[PDB]
Amino acid sequence: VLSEGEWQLVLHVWAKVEADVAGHGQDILIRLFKSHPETLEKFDRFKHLKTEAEMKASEDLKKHGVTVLTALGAILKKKGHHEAELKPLAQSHATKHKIPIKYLEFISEAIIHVLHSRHPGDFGADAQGAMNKALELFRKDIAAKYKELGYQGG
Numbered sequence: 391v392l393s394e395g396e397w398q399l400v401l402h403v404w405a406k407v408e409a410d411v412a413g414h415g416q417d418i419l420i421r422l423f424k425s426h427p428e429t430l431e432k433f434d435r436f437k438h439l440k441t442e443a444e445m446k447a448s449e450d451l452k453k454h455g456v457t458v459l460t461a462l463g464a465i466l467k468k469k470g471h472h473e474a475e476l477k478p479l480a481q482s483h484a485t486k487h488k489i490p491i492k493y494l495e496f497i498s499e500a501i502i503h504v505l506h507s508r509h510p511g512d513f514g515a516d517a518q519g520a521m522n523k524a525l526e527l528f529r530k531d532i533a534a535k536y537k538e539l540g541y542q543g544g
């Protein structure tokens with residue numbers, strides 16, 4: 391789907407994420423919750439966290455951010471050949487809970503924001519476009535897996 395050069399830009403910046411998965415995951419989740427507070431409602435065990443400092447101090451939130459970015463990184467490294475990885479994630483997101491595709495757009499925005507805030511020298515326009523396409527592909531394929539399970543993602 392993406393070109394080889396696009397995937398290489400995606401994985402180049404992802405290598406920077408891997409130097410500090412926990413910190414990236416905290417900042418991505420906090421940006422998501424700050425920018426779109428309705429998403430915090432989906433996490434019953436994070437609802438009692440009232441400030442950014444409380445969110446940074448929560449080991450539970452930090453652990454979940456690592457779980458999130460580990461799954462995403464594994465998907466990105468498949469360079470689109472990710473059906474076996476996306477199916478369980480769709481089930482996690484469409485069965486136990488109901489995570490609309492729009493919420494995946496919100497977290498994608500937070501991912502772009504944090505990557506550019508931390509790594510501007512390795513996340514210029516071409517890299518941003520590549521990551522945007524990779525996350526678009528992720529969201530499109532997740533949406534199809536949602537429908538397979540009976541969830542329209544709305």
Ligand code: HEM
Pocket residue numbers: 429430432433435457458459461462479482483487489493494497498
């Ligand atoms: C890049 C996008 C995302 C990725 C890669 C991702 C990944 C994951 C993973 C790996 C799990 C654990 C699944 C398991 O082990 O059973 C999970 C659970 C969950 N996700 Fe996501 N997630 C993403 C976005 C979101 C968003 C945007 C929301 C809500 C607005 C959300 C809500 C949840 C909830 C509520 C759970 C259950 C966690 C719990 O039981 O405490 N996810 N996610």
